[PDB]
Every structure is written in C-alpha cells, then in structure tokens.
Design an enzyme around this catalytic site. Structure first.
Site, short mmCIF file in Angstrom:
data_model
loop_
_atom_site.label_atom_id
_atom_site.label_comp_id
_atom_site.label_asym_id
_atom_site.label_seq_id
_atom_site.Cartn_x
_atom_site.Cartn_y
_atom_site.Cartn_z
N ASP A 267 0.87 -1.21 0.00
CA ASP A 267 0.00 0.00 0.00
C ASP A 267 0.89 1.24 0.00
OD1 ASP A 267 -2.41 1.59 0.21
OD2 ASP A 267 -1.93 1.84 2.35
N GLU B 192 1.28 -0.63 -4.61
CA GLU B 192 0.06 0.15 -4.86
C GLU B 192 0.41 1.40 -5.67
OE1 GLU B 192 -1.91 3.01 -2.22
OE2 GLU B 192 -3.81 2.00 -2.53
#
Lengths: 604, 604
Positions: B336, B373
């Site tokens: 992420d 991400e």
C-alpha cells in the site's frame, strides 16, 4: 484555434518564499472552464486548482497561476497542466497538447533545491586529445624515448608533427602533444572564447590514447608528469577556465600492476592466482580475464570487491576523490563506458556503483561536474540522478547527423526531416528537468567519431548551420580540437589528426563563427539559462526561441534552398526589438526571410 | 505495401541452448535489402545481422532471423529492428514502424533467464476486504466487542450485512467478516474459478480498513487471528490456492506501539522525545510528526533509520520475512502506498527501500510475488526490477475507465476513442518486459476507487466488454470481491459493500460471464503466457489477438452501435477454425460483423 504555451523558466517559473509559481498561457476559442496543475507532492500525483488572473500579460492571451509548496518534499519539481471543459479533457505538456495523461519523464520539470554544477550552465567546453594538439618546445628526454606497446606487439612510432596519420599502428603512433603545449596554448583558447577543457586520459599508460590505464595517481611521462598538470591546473585557474579529466573506471589496461598480463613486472591477476586483486578482475573457468569487448588490451573491473570500491571511489584516498581534492581540486570527471562499469564482469548493480562515485565526488567538490558517455538512450542513469550531466549523443549530435549529414550512429543511411528531428529532440529533453537540460554535453563530433565536416560529404556547406545550432541549443556546448579551424577526418585513427598551427592550414572563416556565437552566447542570459520552445519545424526549416524573464532569442535553420515561412503567431514573436545578430535572413511581420542553407539568429 | 509483425513469445522469440533466436515477419512491396537486430549486452547497443529464412512461414510471408548470446549479458534483454535500404532507414518497435530510433525502455524486451514469480500469470485473483466479505457463523468471544476509535472520536459501530452502508462513521462501521468466513466460502470461489487470494489489510487495527497497523506481529482479533490466518492458509495450501498479504509499509498506525499518539501505550514516539523510536518517524518543530497526507493516524516512517530498516525488512525476523517463512508461507506482498516510502518523512531514496523489502521478501520466499500500490505511472520502478508487478491502474484500469466509462482518475470530464486509448495501453506495455506484462495486476476498481458498475452510469451495457478485457488482455486478473455478483458502490466509504449471499440479489448473469472467462483463461496457453497485438483500432471498436506458437485467440469489442469492420490482413489471420467461444459477432473472411455493446471472442 486554442493554443497554450509554457516554458520551465522565470517568465512563468518564479520562486517566492516556500512556494514555486508555475504559470501558463492560453490563447484561443472555446477556452477551458478550469485548469488544474498535476504535480508530484512527494511522489504522489496530485492536482492543484489554477487561478485565472484579471491582469492580462500580453493582450488577447490570459494567464493562469498556481503554487507548488516547496517547504517539504523532494527537489525535482515535476508537473503538468490539466485543462478542463465539462466533457472534454486535453492535457498540456512539454511535448505539447495530449489527450491521454502523459508519463512522469515526459513533463515540465525544475530542480528547485538545485545542488548540482551551477557553474557549467554558462560555459563552452573544448575537447582535446593531448597527443595531437600542441608539442611543447623544451622536451624532457622521457617525452621522446621509444617504448614497446606489448598490447599491440610493436614499438611506438614517434613521428614529426607534419607526418600523415596512417591506418597502421593506430593506437600506438605518437606526435607528442603535452599539457605544456596546452599550457603554452592557454592564450589561443582565451581569445577563441573557450572557458573549459575536457581532458582525455593523462595517467601513466602505454597507448597514445592512454585508456589502457597503468596507474590512476600519476600522469604519463610522454603526456608530461604531475608537473605538466599542476601547471595547466594553476595557469587555467587564473584565466577563468575549467578543467575536467577523462577517467576509465570500467576497465584498466592489461599492463596495470593490478592485472599485469605481460609478466613485465609483478603482482598481476592474469598469470598469478593469489594476486591480492584476483577478485578485482573477472576470469572464467578457462581462467582468461574479462576484457572490454574482446580488446585484450582492456581488463574488465569487478566492483563486487569491497576493496576495489575503496580504491575507486569510497575510501578517503580513492582515485575519484584523489584528483578532486587538494593539490588538484580538478573541476570534475568524464565517465568512460559509464553504462558498462559493474560487478562479476557485467553491469550487475551498475546504477549502484555509478551512483556511488558521484556521491564521493560530491563530498569532496560539492560543485563537481560528472558526465556519462551514453551513445544511446541515457534517460535513467539521469532519471535517477547518478550523474550531473550526460554527453548528449542522442538528444543533440546524432539528430544533426540525420538531418544535416543524412546518417546515423552506425554510418548507415538515415532520412529524416525537421519535424521528425524536432520531435526526437523535444522528446528526449522532455525527460529532463530544465536545470537538467542546461548541463547537457551537446557536441557534434569527437575522437569516437569521424570529424563532423568529413561526414557531411557532398553537403559540407551545411557545417555552419551545425556550428550555429551548436551554440543556441539548451545545455553546455563543446568543441573537439580542430573543429573550430575546419579540420577533417574519418573514424579512428583518422579523427585524431594533428592540429595545424600554420594559418595557411586553418579555415579562419569558420574560426570567426565560433567566436561570435561564443561571445553572443556569453552576452545572452537567454541562450545559456533560458527555456526553448520549437516554433516551426517542417520539411527543411527549423525555428525555435530561447527565453528567460524578458530576453528572447529566435533561430532559423534551413537545410534547403532559400524560402519563406509563415511563423504561426506566437506570444514569443511579439518582442520589442528584432535586432539581427547572426545569419542573413529578415523577419518581416511574421513572415520569415531565409537565404538558402541559412542559420540565422535574432535577439533583444 | 511494406509492413511487419513481431511479438516477444514463441514462435518468434524462441530459446535455444545458450542462444535466444529472434525472428521477424514481413509483407509488402519494396522489401528492405538488409536488416540488423539491435540488442543490449550490458547496456551496450550493438548489431546482430539478420538473415532471411529459406522456408517462408506462410503464403505472403518473408522471415528474417538472428541470435542473442545468453552465456553473458544481463537477464532482461532489450531488442529492436533496424531495417536498411540503400538510402532510407526504418525502425520497427512494439508501437510499430517509426522513423526515430527507439527509446531504450520502449524496445522489445524479454527476461531470459526469468527471475520473478512465473506462476503469477497463471493465477486468477480474488481481492478480499475481511470485515465486509464473510462472517463465520461460529463467532469468537471478543470477535463482536466494540471499543473507542480515538482516531475518529466516537465508538466503533457494529452492524449486520443488510444494513445500508452509511457515509458517516466511515472508518468505524463493522459488519463482521473474518479469516474463517473467507475459509468457509472457499467453495464460492473455487466455483468462480479463482486460484489465489489478495488479502487486504489484516494486521491488528482499531479502524476497519486496517492501514493503521497496530501490531505488525499479530492478526487482529475482529478480523480472524494468528490461528485463523494459519487456517485460511492451510485451506488455500490444500485447496491449492495462493494467499498474498498486504504490506502497509510507508507508515504505521498512530495508536500502534511505536508512536502511541494515545496516552494508552508506552515508549511511544509521540509524547516521549527520547524514545528509542523517535528516529522511526520524522517530525517537525511544532512537535507535529510527518503524517500521511495530513491524516494523523498514519505517521509516515523515516527510513534513514537503520533500526527500522532491520525491523521492516533487512532483519531476519523482519515484518517482511516473517509471513513468507514458516509458519505462514504467504506467497508475497501488496505494498500500500509503496511510492512514498523513503527518508526525511518523504521519498528520499525511495527506490533504495522498495527494492529492499522486495529483496527481503525473495531472500525468504525465493519464489515470492511482490506488488506495489501505484495509482499512476510505475514505469521507472519496474524498469529497475524493484517490483515484480503493481496494481495496474494506469496500465489497464484507467485506459479502460476513459474508453468504457468516460472518466479519469480524479475528474469525470473525459472523452476518448479506441485509437487514443489503445496507444496509451501499448505505450505502458512497451515500457514493461513481457515477463512483467503477464505479472501486471489488472483490476477494474477496488477499495480506494468507485465501483466500475456505478462509473458506467447510464451505460452499464458495456460492463460485459470490460469483464472480457480483464481476463483476455495480458496480465493477471484480480476480481475485487463483489463485481462478479454485480455489487455496487461509489467511493472508499461506499465501494466496500458487504458481499450479498442471497441469490435473488446477485446479478447471476454477470457471475456466469466470469466463470466462462476464468475457465477460458485457464484452458488457454495464450491468455496466460502469450503475446498480444492490437489489429484494429477505431472509434468504439477494438480488435486484438493473443498469440502463442500455434494457438490463437481473437477478441473484439464495440462499446457503440453495431457495425461491420474491414479487418486488415495479417499472418495471424490464417487460423484453422476460429471457434466462437463468446459474443455474437461473427467473422466472415476478414469482414467482422460486430453487434452493439458486443464483447465477441474466438479461438482455434
């Protein structure tokens, strides 16, 4: 029609407190309702609403302005403009208008916290191969003693300056130039206008080109000594000049004490396995060592060895930091086959060691200038910032080989036009921030190429245009010795002809040209630290303008018969004073008046 | 009319002992007299003489071939075509014929040998958002407790599946999924055809989205647990599925051990300045710490701290290598916000660290899959090899969002046609090596975007096309839980609706389509490991073909009114039996009959 314009320079790009100011121009029908500024808040593409401004900068064209908070984040200031309608979306970029969002490389950029060679943003460089330029008059007996080039298996041929360049013994023939001949010719350049020298290898070695390094800490006797250089260093320092040397860290020579191959001495990694540097060089099962492109003359260097990395760049007395600290304080380093220096005789973690060196330099000489020898796409060595600059073979030189000489880097046919070229140029440059564009090493020929004049073949008349282009294009330009004086030659060993100092040999017509564009470039804030927006490129005409706060500089190239062109209107062409500087063409109310094969230059 | 064809998989790119052997197809008048093949041996662009072939692959086919030495050089070999005549020169690259010499990182590219997860292209992925997927009937003791979400200034809100999802209390509304509920619905997926799970943030967190990791060393009590994460693993391992975990690594949670921005921990870096974790974050002078996009709950971490750097990845039981070792054997990670990871609470030496965690994830799991991400261009990082792949938002999702939904990343205003779209897609591919194009993590929406169905607005009709695309375009698909059963939503607080298990609420029509596509993809060598070349690009119609050795697969979409198409001839267009597998386009000898909103497909 709607047209927009922006350059990564002060007119637009203006620093105030911790807020950089990016401004854009808009001139046309059906204007967008909103404009956004897609920048990289610390690697996160965002969008900032731009403001319209009651105040109109030049009439009929509106200006829109937004910020980039500079108090935090990385130094590269990347950005682009999102023009918004209610249903339509068109993007405005360096490369121009787009409908599909562009790439991170292809976008306007600025190094706000610029900590790179700021000097060298206003320089002309002069390239010299010390053995073919100038023979000094009092010559130590060691500068003419004949020695054996084991590498080639013949003794070196000492020759009289006026003897011809032969195909035989190419890397072994010596005319005898020295740093005392350049320290003797320190006046010739100053008047020509050179401001900085690029110095091929001057360390002990056997060849005439001295790329088979034999020691990195001392200067070859034939070239001179730590003596000849201490002089050229100190003597240039007074005259304003700058000095960058040639290193080869991708390889040494089979004669270096490190990888001795001739049993001429002791300690060599070739025929001795327990050498303290046997892991510093790569050898396969068959035990033969890893040489650069099959030249047994050049042993490959394996930077996996923690020790090598100390000798080369990390340790306090590294070869890199060495020539860059007291008593030398050299102005920087040139990278030989920079895209080949790695480990296990390959490019393993290449960006690791390249990046490494330039750190070490930067702790020694914060202002030092480091150049990559990239004959092809060099983008990332630089997208990464492992280098201050890259010899711009792709962005500047080879593009002019196709256009003006109709040939490519491998000397094959190459048919391009102005449109194709200006795209190619504008594309590569788009990958570099403005402060990156300004430090580029855009030259036209070198010792790795034929002399440019000899390539043009039947279009030799075009050489001017090339030398006119060379000083108006963004970056730092360079001049390989012999070019200003109209020298000739095909590829090595003929692009290494001895310099003619007898006026009866120089084409002084050329020599004037340099001086003017040399001086005018120095007189111009524009042509040194200014942006560049191509204005017209089609068929055989090229046109652009360098730009800063108010200074503007147009150019026009033609590789064809004379003609006229309709410069599509542009806010750059509304200057107060179209004072002709170079060329023989005349700008009359937006129509351009060019002699054939012209290279013209305007200015205010 | 001269034209040429080449794609980086066999029959063209075919390995042979210690030599990869490259071939090129050619159709047209005026064949070129010579062809050279430009490869890179250690960032060195050379030339490899192509020879024409005696046995012509097909009628109207001339073929030229040459060799690439594998005993040396670097793994991912870039190559391109330089066609020579006596006076002009043409270059052939992915994006086709061109006059400019090709960019380095847009040349054809092949990883030989391969390094990354090979089994990657073979997967189909299911992305799960625990608390909103499957609630296990046998609830645990504390699995249903409610606490104070200090980060929100309210208590967390307990709710049951059929309640409407509210905007307010975004990070606090909990419906009750867990890791066992995932394990028990593994029937539901094995039916769908999935082979591996992407499991969104699953480590201890007081929120619902779990990006504020609060114990990196244990699984949250409300989202399953260590034993439950080792059960869901036991199943996937036996069932044969792959489970990839999410690495929330640019920052920690502000209630986590290390920061303790609440007065309910100890040693926390917030209100204790000497805590051994002060250098794990960067702060400012008003005590403020560097908070992730101003959200105090995710303080960003300062990676210039060696202390952290062993904790996150270099150290043996680092949070990265922990879950890739016994007892958990995860199959890799999803980083992420991986782009903003760096030092001085910013991206200083970003790429250095990203590769470090990805390097720590392989050293433990040699066959690991590491995904970042990336909401934007990830190209430079991928060319570094610092990520095997990435959520392919700009390389698949957004190109599609423009065409099929007519919307951008932050603004709806957007109109594109098939041609504009397709270049976008080929571009991003060109910069990616094939071994990576198949590893790119194609999805259509997610927990940080609006649900595709609701993006489509009044044109839901096209959802079928997209679904075909997701499984047929090169790369690995990742069906985000819900869209198969026609789940709706709109933003980060509305795009994570609880999975509806009531057959009467599911658009089972949609579910069907998946199954077929998933299976079709599973049967085909092509759709997993094979090349791709767009064959026709106009307005609403796109026609493309995945190809391998002999196997072929046609596809053709039309997001608009129906029509007929004049399919340009091609050497792939001699298939023996193009057996329609899906769609109601029928193909009559190169004339294609495309119904409106059709997502047709063939195979041989």
């Amino acid at each position: 029609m709607l047209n927009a314009w922006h350059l990564p320079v002060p007119p637009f790009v203006k620093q105030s407190k911790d807020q950089l100011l990016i401004t854009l121009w808009l001139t046309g029908e059906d204007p967008p309702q909103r404009i956004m500024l897609r920048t990289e808040h610390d690697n996160e593409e965002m969008s900032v609403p731009m403001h319209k401004q009651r105040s109109q900068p030049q009439p009929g064209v509106t200006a829109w302005r937004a910020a980039i908070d500079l108090s935090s984040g990385q130094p590269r200031r990347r950005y682009s403009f999102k023009l918004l309608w209610h249903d339509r979306q068109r993007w405005f970029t360096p490369q121009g208008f787009s409908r599909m969002p562009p790439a991170r490389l292809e976008q306007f950029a600025v190094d706000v916290p610029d900590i790179g060679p700021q000097w060298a943003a206003d320089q002309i460089f002069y390239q010299i191969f010390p053995d073919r330029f100038a023979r000094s008059l009092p010559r130590e007996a060691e500068q003419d003693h004949v020695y054996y080039h084991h590498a080639a298996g013949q003794e070196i041929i000492l020759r009289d300056w006026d003897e011809p360049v032969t195909a035989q013994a190419g890397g072994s023939t010596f005319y005898g130039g020295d740093l005392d001949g350049i320290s003797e010719k320190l006046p010739y350049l100053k008047k020509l206008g050179v401001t900085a020298l690029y110095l091929n290898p001057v360390f002990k070695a056997p060849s005439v080109h001295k790329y088979d390094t034999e020691d990195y800490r001392h200067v070859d006797p034939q070239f001179g000594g730590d003596g000849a250089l201490l002089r050229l260093r100190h003597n240039t320092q007074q005259l304003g000049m700058r000095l960058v040397l040639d290193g080869v860290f991708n390889h040494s020579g089979d004669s270096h004490a490190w990888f001795d191959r001739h049993n001429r001495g002791t300690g060599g990694a070739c025929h001795n396995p327990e050498s303290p540097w046997r892991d510093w060089y790569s050898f396969s099962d068959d035990g033969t060592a890893l040489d650069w492109l099959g030249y047994a003359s050049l042993p490959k260097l394996d930077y996996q060895s923690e020790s090598l990395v100390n000798e080369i760049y990390r340790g306090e007395d590294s070869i890199v930091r060495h020539w860059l600290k007291a008593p030398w304080n050299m102005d920087g380093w040139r990278l030989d086959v920079v895209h080949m220096l790695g480990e296990a005789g390959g490019a393993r973690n290449n960006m690791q060691h390249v990046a490494g060196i330039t750190e070490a330099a930067k702790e020694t000489q914060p202002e030092a200038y480091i150049v990559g020898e990239h004959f092809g796409d060099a983008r990332q060595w630089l997208q990464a910032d492992v280098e201050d600059a890259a010899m711009n073979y792709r962005g500047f030189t080879f593009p002019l080989w196709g256009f003006l000489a109709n040939t490519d880097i491998s000397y094959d046919p190459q048919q391009i036009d102005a449109q194709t070229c200006m795209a190619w140029m504008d594309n590569y440059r788009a990958g570099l921030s403005h402060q990156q564009q300004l430090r580029m090493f855009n030259q036209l020929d070198s010792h790795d190429t034929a002399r440019f004049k000899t390539l043009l073949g039947r279009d030799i008349a075009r050489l001017p245009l090339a030398v006119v282009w060379l000083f108006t294009w963004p970056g730092v330009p360079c001049i390989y010795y012999g070019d200003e004086v109209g020298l000739d030659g095909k590829n090595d060993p003929f692009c290494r002809k001895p310099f003619p100092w007898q006026v009866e040999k120089q084409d002084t017509a050329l020599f004037a040209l340099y001086q003017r564009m040399i001086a005018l470039r120095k007189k111009s804030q524009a042509l040194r630290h200014g942006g560049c927006q191509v204005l017209y490129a089609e068929d055989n005409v090229v046109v652009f303008v360098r730009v800063l706060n108010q200074q503007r500089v147009l150019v026009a190239i033609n590789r064809g018969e004379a003609c006229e062109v309709v410069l599509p209107a542009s806010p750059f062409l509304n200057a107060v004073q179209w004072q002709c500087k170079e060329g023989h063409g005349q700008l009359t109310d937006g129509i351009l008046a060019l002699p054939a094969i012209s290279a013209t230059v305007w200015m205010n």
